[PDB]
Amino acid sequence: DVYAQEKQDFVQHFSQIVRVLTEDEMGHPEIGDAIARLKEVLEYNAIGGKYNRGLTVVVAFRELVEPRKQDADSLQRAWTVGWCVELLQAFFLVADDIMDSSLTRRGQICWYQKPGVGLDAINDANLLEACIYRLLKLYCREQPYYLNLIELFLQSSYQTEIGQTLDLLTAPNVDLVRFTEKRYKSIVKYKTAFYSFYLPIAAAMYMAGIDGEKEHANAKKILLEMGEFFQIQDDYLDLFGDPSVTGKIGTDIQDNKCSWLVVQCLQRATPEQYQILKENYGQKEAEKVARVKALYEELDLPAVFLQYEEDSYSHIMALIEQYAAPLPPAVFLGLARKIYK
Amino acid sequence: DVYAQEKQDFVQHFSQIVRVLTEDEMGHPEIGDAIARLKEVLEYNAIGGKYNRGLTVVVAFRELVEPRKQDADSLQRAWTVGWCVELLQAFFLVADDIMDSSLTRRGQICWYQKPGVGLDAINDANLLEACIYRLLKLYCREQPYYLNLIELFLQSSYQTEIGQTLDLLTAPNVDLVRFTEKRYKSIVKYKTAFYSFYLPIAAAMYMAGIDGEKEHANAKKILLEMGEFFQIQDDYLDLFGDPSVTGKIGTDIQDNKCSWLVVQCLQRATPEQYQILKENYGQKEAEKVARVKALYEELDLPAVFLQYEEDSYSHIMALIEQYAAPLPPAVFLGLARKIYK
Ligand SMILES: Cc1ccc(-c2cc3c(N[C@@H](Cc4cccc(F)c4)P(=O)(O)O)ncnc3s2)cc1
Numbered sequence: 249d250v251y252a253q254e255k256q257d258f259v260q261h262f263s264q265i266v267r268v269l270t271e272d273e274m275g276h277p278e279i280g281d282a283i284a285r286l287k288e289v290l291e292y293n294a295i296g297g298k299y300n301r302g303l304t305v306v307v308a309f310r311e312l313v314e315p316r317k318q319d320a321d322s323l324q325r326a327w328t329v330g331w332c333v334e335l336l337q338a339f340f341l342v343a344d345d346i347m348d349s350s351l352t353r354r355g356q357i358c359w360y361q362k363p364g365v366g367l368d369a370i371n372d373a374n375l376l377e378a379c380i381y382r383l384l385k386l387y388c389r390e391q392p393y394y395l396n397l398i399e400l401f402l403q404s405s406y407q408t409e410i411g412q413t414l415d416l417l418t419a420p421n422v423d424l425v426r427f428t429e430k431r432y433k434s435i436v437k438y439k440t441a442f443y444s445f446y447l448p449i450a451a452a453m454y455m456a457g458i459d460g461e462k463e464h465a466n467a468k469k470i471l472l473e474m475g476e477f478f479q480i481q482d483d484y485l486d487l488f489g490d491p492s493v494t495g496k497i498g499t500d501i502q503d504n505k506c507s508w509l510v511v512q513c514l515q516r517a518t519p520e521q522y523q524i525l526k527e528n529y530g531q532k533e534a535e536k537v538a539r540v541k542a543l544y545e546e547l548d549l550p551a552v553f554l555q556y557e558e559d560s561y562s563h564i565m566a567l568i569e570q571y572a573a574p575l576p577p578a579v580f581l582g583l584a585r586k587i588y589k
Numbered sequence: 590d591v592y593a594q595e596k597q598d599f600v601q602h603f604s605q606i607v608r609v610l611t612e613d614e615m616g617h618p619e620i621g622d623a624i625a626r627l628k629e630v631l632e633y634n635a636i637g638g639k640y641n642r643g644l645t646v647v648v649a650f651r652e653l654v655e656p657r658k659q660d661a662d663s664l665q666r667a668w669t670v671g672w673c674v675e676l677l678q679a680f681f682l683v684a685d686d687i688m689d690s691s692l693t694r695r696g697q698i699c700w701y702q703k704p705g706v707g708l709d710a711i712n713d714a715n716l717l718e719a720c721i722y723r724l725l726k727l728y729c730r731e732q733p734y735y736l737n738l739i740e741l742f743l744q745s746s747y748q749t750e751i752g753q754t755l756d757l758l759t760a761p762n763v764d765l766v767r768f769t770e771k772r773y774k775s776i777v778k779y780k781t782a783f784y785s786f787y788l789p790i791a792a793a794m795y796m797a798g799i800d801g802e803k804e805h806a807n808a809k810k811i812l813l814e815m816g817e818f819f820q821i822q823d824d825y826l827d828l829f830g831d832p833s834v835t836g837k838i839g840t841d842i843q844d845n846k847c848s849w850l851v852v853q854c855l856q857r858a859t860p861e862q863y864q865i866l867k868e869n870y871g872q873k874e875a876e877k878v879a880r881v882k883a884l885y886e887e888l889d890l891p892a893v894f895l896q897y898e899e900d901s902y903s904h905i906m907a908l909i910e911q912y913a914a915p916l917p918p919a920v921f922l923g924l925a926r927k928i929y930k
Pocket residue numbers: 310311312313314315317456457458574575576
């Protein structure tokens with residue numbers, strides 16, 4: 249609800265985001281061609297998602313800030329910083345698709361896969377990253393929270409990258425002894441939860457003057473837990489989701505991923521059952537993948553998940569009770585609804 | 590002289606740079622493996638060069654700052670920021686080697702070429718980039734010039750990237766109608782001169798309290814010119830250098846580069862001579878490359894270069910006369926000597 253209410257004004261803002269990033273000056277003729285490429289990059293990779301992360305910036309700013317202080321310009325800064333989050337995401341995905349050898353993304357040929365692009369997408373990804381800071385300069389350099397947001401984004405980049413390293417180390421080689429629960433939790437926190445859940449809320453907080461380290465730590469405690477659950481639910485749905493509801497068809501098992509499902513399987517399986525999996529984890533051949541699906545069902549994992557989901561909701565609600573103050577608990581509850589839904 | 594004097598203390602500092610970046614905390618066990626990878630990355634890619642760029646930070650800080658204010662801690666910040674420059678460079682090179690399909694770098698297998706690495710070097714390059722900001726936080730967060738340096742590095746990244754885009758657009762396809770002088774100048778300024786020449790001096794300036802926009806613009810005017818010359822001399826030596834003196838064996842013509850030599854050739858060549866080049870520009874076959882070398886000699890380019898070199902030195906000395914003030918002209922002269930040498 250509160251997110252379909254913001255979405256038109258947020259997607260309309262993108263046009264302006266591109267105008268000012270691609271604003272080719274009459275004293276810098278000869279980069280035009282390069283700026284033309286930049287626009288193409290932005291248009292292909294920053295659009296076509298659901299925009300949940302960037303929208304969360306905008307929704308949180310509306311719950312955090314006295315409506316008396318939500319002038320046009322403040323709102324516009326909120327949309328801009330929400331766009332910065334989407335650009336951070338776009339930088340990571342263009343680059344991860346290259347690394348994974350992915351084919352599609354958001355049902356569209358991955359950018360690096362287009363003819364004429366290739367490994368040049370490395371630089372394109374780096375430009376997406378840079379755009380973040382250009383935007384924060386342009387829209388926010390005079391604000392008191394400016395440096396807070398630069399450091400936020402930079403930290404968020406570092407965490408995600410470091411998470412990405414751990415993910416890469418963890419799946420070089422089928423060696424399933426690498427796929428510990430500890431290790432799974434740690435990949436999720438670094439690689440996806442900091443930027444997906446902490447970052448957008450933290451950004452809004454800084455924009456609203458809330459810059460305390462305890463405040464931030466309390467929000468972080470709640471949000472990293474949410475982020476763990478979201479990814480767990482994602483791993484689950486990769487296999488048992490309906491592609492109609494999810495809009496993703498899942499290949500986790502072919503891609504020998506450190507998925508929550510694989511992790512639970514290995515905590516639970518007799519030495520015999522280790523072996524069936526050790527066999528079918530990764531082959532393309534569909535009867536390979538189908539025989540892990542059926543093992544997952546035979547280990548009652550869909551129910552393990554359902555117990556984990558209830559457990560998780562109870563914990564989140566306790567975290568919110570304890571650590572939301574002095575933020576409105578709605579900030580968190582609105583997110584919880586978006587992902588326990 | 591002034592640079593062999595700083596070099597021992599600057600290369601010794603690297604060890605500490607790695608200690609603090611790889612300082613794995615007793616409350617963050619499970620990223621250790623990832624941090625181990627990070628150390629490997631730093632050790633392989635940030636070492637083995639001549640360190641001119643980072644050293645220039647340190648030399649300039651010593652000429653800019655009253656010796657009364659060159660305490661241990663200030664010096665250490667200077668070495669650190671000089672290392673940040675080397676890390677920016679390392680990020681660009683690991684990533685450019687992947688993009689170009691390069692084989693070696695500093696006579697060492699390119700990092701992405703090592704078995705076990707590959708396209709994972711994309712993320713490794715991104716970690717090199719992040720290290721810059723981790724270091725500036727650690728060593729400089731309390732300094733008044735902190736935000737100045739963050740913005741400096743970020744801008745320097747953006748310029749180099751945007752230059753890299755233009756370079757890529759310019760050589761997709763042998764189309765030599767793309768290789769205008771205007772275009773060559775513009776690739777050099779963005780892609781190499783801002784970060785190679787402006788950045789290190791600008792960093793030292795900010796560290797010394799010199800933060801004025803005119804000051805900075807005056808230093809920029811001098812330094813971008815130096816940077817243009819340096820790259821021109823580099824293009825020249827790629828072909829006519831002695832590999833003994835240079836320590837690089839040059840492949841510019843095989844790699845169909847927008848080299849200064851190619852640009853001059855095309856300004857100068859009859860429609861007939863267009864064709865010989867249009868033929869031999871890019872083949873591996875050595876008699877291809879040799880027949881462009883011989884055309885370059887037949888167009889008197891080695892002398893065109895020598896006239897360009899004298900022209901350039903005269904101009905630099907006028908720029909220094911006009912725009913150095915109130916910096917000590919030695920700051921610039923010390924650099925000029927490093928590259929007109
Ligand atoms: C719909 C709607 C949205 C926001 C609010 C309020 C925000 C707010 C408020 N938020 C402030 C930021 C803030 C600080 C600490 C904790 C917060 F949750 C918010 P401001 O940036 O000054 O607007 N401070 C005091 N009263 C109110 S009432 C009231 C109604």
